[PDB]
RNA sequence: CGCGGGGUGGAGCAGCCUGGUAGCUCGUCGGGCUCAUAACCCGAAGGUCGUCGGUUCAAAUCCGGCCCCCGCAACCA
RNA sequence: GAAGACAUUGUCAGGUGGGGAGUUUGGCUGGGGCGGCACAUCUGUUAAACGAUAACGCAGAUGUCCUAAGGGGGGCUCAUG
RNA sequence: UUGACAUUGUGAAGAGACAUAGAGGGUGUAGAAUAAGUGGGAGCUUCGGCGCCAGUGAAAUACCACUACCUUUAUAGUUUC
């Protein structure tokens, strides 16, 4: 026989992420001393569109 | 097919070798198990990749088998091998052929 | 082995406080089946008695009617078939012959319930009466498989010895390993307990 | 473990007897295979042998030992002067070691008639037609 | 679904902005073009029935027939898994689905 | 064939473990009830409980053989 | 920190397993296929009065039954009118 | 994918389970009587509880071992979860 659509995507060549216009990972921060004892203030400056 | 459960005939049993009495029965298949040379011989070539090494048989065209009689002599312990000819229904007890019966009920 | 201390050897002829004869019972243990072809029959050969005073319903004529008075109990004949049809059941183990196999069709109306008829279960109808009478008054009980698998009889009374009660359960034990097929189990001689009526039971 | 055959998706192409993937024993032990891998890192030294020390369930541990065929202390001495010879160039890569002559079957016996002087050498030898100028 | 975790994991108060996005028809595939032109390559999309036998276990034939059930077994080959694997029921739903 | 289940009025099923009495419906005849028909309830005709042997104070039932049908399974002339 | 000295990995056995591997998928024959069995066999005929002798020729038929429908002895005569 | 063996060591608690020790309770007619129930028995006991040779049923009963089929019925010696 041949190969199907999902068996082909296992390599991930064109089936991958088109990431470029992304300003990074929208993660958080590492939970430390301040984040589990009181707090800390973060100031938002710009809110663009991903 | 009806036959006797006993029959007199020639039995070359050394001390005998004349007409005696044998209590007739039937030959059973037995048991194959292991120890057979072909058993180890077969599962030698059979062990591993390749699947089936020797042929089978799916060409069964026969419907009947030859019934063998296993009658042992009540004098010298020796059993006898007597076969007949392919049948369907079989027996050896009673219900022999009676003189004159009808088709009642 | 069995000839040592107990089972049905010597330690029972002392714990008896009764005036009557207290007979023992042979109760063995071995796993069998529920078929009639996988069951063992035959009667045991005992050289010693059981010390019993039971009454038999004997009846012989000809050359077996004079010896049927020294080995037997009561003098009965063949013409006696009109009397055995009313109410008498004082018969535990009887004895007939081949001289009375033709009028044995008149002993089933009042004597087929408790089995006082010569059929094919207990060896009773035979023309021999001088050798088998050391097994009637010298008691020779039967070995027949009941609902399951067991044979209950009597060895003897606890008023004999250990020289006589040692050659009774050693020769009867030869039919308890011989007539045994393979439709049964292991240990044809295991947990063997025996009691009389008064004195307790001792295992083996 | 074993030596799974490098087949794409499990594609071998042949007789069923010639289609093994998991049940590939590989005629060499891990003791012999370990010596040859270190014979590639320290390929400048003449490897000797090794021995099984520890184990767990996934890894087999072996202790390796070699010598310096350039160091004067080893180049001399009539005890191990044979190691400094060209014929002793990476004895393990072939199987001239103790464990290599066990996996190859280099032994004396009626149990080693197919490997007396060489596995395939004996094969070639027996199958060759020795024809004299005067055919006997 | 509901899953019990540890009272240590963080989380930002409130809901995210952008409710009602995919809640509007894209109308033309010219914009569906630009959609995956940013995400990843998986579009366009071809039908298994319209394909050949070699291409897909649902392809091959003359009509729009399947041949076998689109229901796959949870323990099947990675070459036979292309449909409704391990479905607890199919067809048109006669309920507000959800959970228990 | 290695194993297991079922077979009961013309139809289709109980009862089996823990043996003594054949329960039910549809098909049929007849009755009761209403002013009468329909529906309903009930009596009876209707089952060698497929075949052989046996145990038992007594076997459709419990054990062993055989027939008819189905399922799992084994499959080296 | 989370699980946990379980899962995990190695090694065997039951299974699932056209995803994929390898291979096969009668003959005779008024083309082939479909239908059949003139393939293992027997009766009469074909068959030309030794023997020999084909057709998808004809009329037919078997793959079993029977401790007796068998073997021996003794007696007897049947269908039909 | 499921079981198994090694990796895989330590402690606790419970549930099943084979061996023991032990106990209990189970058809209609019927005989002043609850009965799967085999054998012996005419006394065990200070009372008499029953007996009993006998007897209705289809089988019997105080003095008690056993065949004992069984009971979501006990030890805490094995084994498993």
- Give the span between the Cα atoms of E48 and E70, in whole angstroms: 11
Q: How many CB atoms lie within 10 A of CB B1?
A: 12
- Based on the structure, what is the number of domains in chain D? 1
Q: What pairs with residue C125 in β-bridges?
A: C96
Strand F positions with any atom < 7 Å from protein CB?
54-55, 62-64, 66-67, 75-77
Find, in chain A, the residue whose alpha carbon is nearest to that of E10.
A31
Nucleotide nearest to C113 (CA to C1'): F57
Q: What is the 3-state secondary structure (H, E, C) of chain C?
A: CCCCCCCCCCCCCCCCCCCCCCECCCECCCCCCCCCCCCCCCCCCCCCCCCCCCCCCECCCHHHCCCCCCCCCCCCCCCCCCCCCCCCCCCCCCEECCCCCCCCCCCCCCCCCCCCCCCCCCCCECCCCCCHHHCCCCCCCCCCCCCCCCCCCCCCECCCCCCCCCCCCCCCCCCCCCCCCCCCCCCCCCCCEECCCCCCCECC
User: Is it the case that chain E and chain A have 3 or more CB pairs lying under 8 Å apart?
Assistant: yes
Q: What are phi and psi of D38, to 5 degrees?
A: -85, -15
Closest CA relative to residue B48, chosen from D17, D22, D25: D17
Q: How many CB atoms lie within 10 A of CB E93?
A: 8
Question: Would you call B82 helix, strand, or coil by DSSP?
Answer: strand
Q: Is there a contact between C162 and C12 (Cβ–Cβ < 8 Å)?
A: no
- Give the span between the Cα atoms of E56 and E68, in whole angstroms: 12
D55 touches strand G (CB under 7 A): no
Size of interface A-E (CB pairs under 8 A): 33
Domain that holds residue D112: 1-136
Residue nearest to nucleotide F65 (CA to C1'): B91
Element (H, E) at E36: helix E29-36
Q: Is there a contact between B47 and B39 (Cβ–Cβ < 8 Å)?
A: no
Distance E92 CA to G52 C1' (A): 82
CB contact under 8 A, A15 and E42: yes
Q: What CATH number corresponds to the domain at position D133?
A: 3.40.1120.10
Which ranges constitute the DSSP H helices of B1-105?
37-45
- Give the span between the Cα atoms of E71 and E83, in whole angstroms: 6
Resolution for this model in angstroms, one decimal place?
6.2
Q: Is there a contact between B6 and B21 (Cβ–Cβ < 8 Å)?
A: yes
Torsion over CA of D21, D27, D30 and D34, rounded to 10 degrees?
Answer: -110
Cβ-Cβ contacts under 8 Å, E37 against chain A:
18
Q: Give the angle C43-C44-C46 at the CA atoms, nearest 5°.
A: 135
Q: Is D17 on the interface with B (CB under 8 A)?
A: yes
Question: Residue E3: is the preceding peptide bond cis (ω within 30°)?
Answer: no
Q: Is there a contact between C127 and C60 (Cβ–Cβ < 8 Å)?
A: no
Cβ-Cβ contacts under 8 Å, B48 against chain D:
17, 23
CB contact under 8 A, A15 and E79: no
Q: Is D19 on the interface with B (CB under 8 A)?
A: yes
Nucleotide nearest to B46 (CA to C1'): F76
- Give the span between the Cα atoms of C198 and C150, in whole angstroms: 23
């Amino acid at each position: 026989g041949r190969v199907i659509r999902n068996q082909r995507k296992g390599a991930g060549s064109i089936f991958t992420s088109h990431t470029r216009l992304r300003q990074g990972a929208a993660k958080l921060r590492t939970l430390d001393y301040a984040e589990r004892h009181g707090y800390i203030r973060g100031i938002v400056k710009q809110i663009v569109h991903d | 097919v009806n036959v006797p459960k006993t029959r007199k005939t020639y039995c070359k049993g050394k001390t005998c070798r004349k007409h005696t009495q044998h209590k007739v029965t039937q030959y059973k298949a037995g048991k194959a198990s292991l120890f057979a040379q072909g058993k180890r011989r077969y599962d030698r070539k059979q062990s591993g990749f390749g699947g089936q090494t020797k042929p089978v048989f799916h060409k069964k065209a026969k419907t009947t088998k030859k019934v063998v009689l296993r009658l042992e002599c009540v004098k010298c312990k020796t059993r006898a091998q007597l076969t007949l000819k392919r049948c369907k229904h079989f027996e050896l007890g009673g219900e022999k052929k009676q003189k004159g019966q009808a088709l009642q009920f | 082995v069995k000839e040592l201390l107990k089972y049905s050897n010597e330690t029972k002829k002392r714990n008896f406080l009764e005036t009557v004869e207290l007979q023992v019972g042979l109760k063995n243990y071995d796993p069998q089946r529920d078929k009639r072809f996988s069951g063992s029959l035959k009667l045991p050969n005992c050289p010693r008695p059981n010390m019993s005073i039971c009454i038999f319903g004997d009846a012989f004529d000809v050359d077996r009617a004079k010896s049927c008075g020294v080995d037997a109990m009561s003098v009965d004949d063949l013409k006696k078939l009109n009397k055995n049809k009313k109410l008498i059941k004082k018969l535990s183990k009887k004895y007939n012959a081949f001289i009375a196999s033709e009028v044995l069709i008149k002993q089933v109306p009042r004597l087929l319930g408790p089995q006082l008829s010569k059929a094919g279960k207990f060896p009773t109808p035979v023309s021999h009466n001088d050798d088998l009478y050391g097994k009637v008054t010298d008691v020779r009980s039967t070995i027949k498989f009941q609902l399951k698998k067991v044979l209950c009889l009597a060895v003897a009374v606890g008023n004999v010895e250990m020289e006589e009660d040692v050659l009774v359960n050693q020769i009867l034990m030869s039919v308890n390993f011989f007539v045994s097929l393979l439709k049964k189990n292991w240990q044809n001689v295991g947990s063997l307990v025996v009691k009389s009526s008064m004195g307790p039971a001792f295992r083996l | 473990g074993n030596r799974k055959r490098p087949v794409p998706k499990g594609a071998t192409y042949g007789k069923p007897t010639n289609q093994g993937v998991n049940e590939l024993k590989y005629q060499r032990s891990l003791r012999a295979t370990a010596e040859e891998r270190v014979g590639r890192r320290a390929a400048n030294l003449r490897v000797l042998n090794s021995y099984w020390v520890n184990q767990d369930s996934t890894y087999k541990y072996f202790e390796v030992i070699l010598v310096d065929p350039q160091h004067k202390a080893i180049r001399r001495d009539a005890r191990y002067n044979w190691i400094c010879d060209p014929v002793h160039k990476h004895r393990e890569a072939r199987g001239l070691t103790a464990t290599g002559k066990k996996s190859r079957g280099i032994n004396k016996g009626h149990k080693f008639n197919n490997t007396k002087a060489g596995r395939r050498k004996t094969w070639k030898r027996q199958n060759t037609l020795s024809l004299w100028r005067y055919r006997k | 679904a509901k899953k019990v975790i540890s009272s240590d994991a963080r989380g930002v108060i409130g809901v995210i902005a952008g409710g009602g996005r995919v809640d509007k028809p894209l109308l033309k595939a010219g914009r569906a073009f630009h959609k995956y032109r940013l995400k990843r390559n998986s579009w366009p999309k071809t039908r298994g029935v319209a394909m050949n036998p070699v291409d897909h276990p649902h392809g091959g034939g003359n009509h729009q027939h399947i041949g076998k059930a689109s229901t796959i077994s949870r323990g099947a080959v990675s070459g036979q898994k292309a449909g409704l694997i391990a479905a607890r029921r199919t067809g048109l739903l006669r309920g507000s689905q959800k959970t228990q």
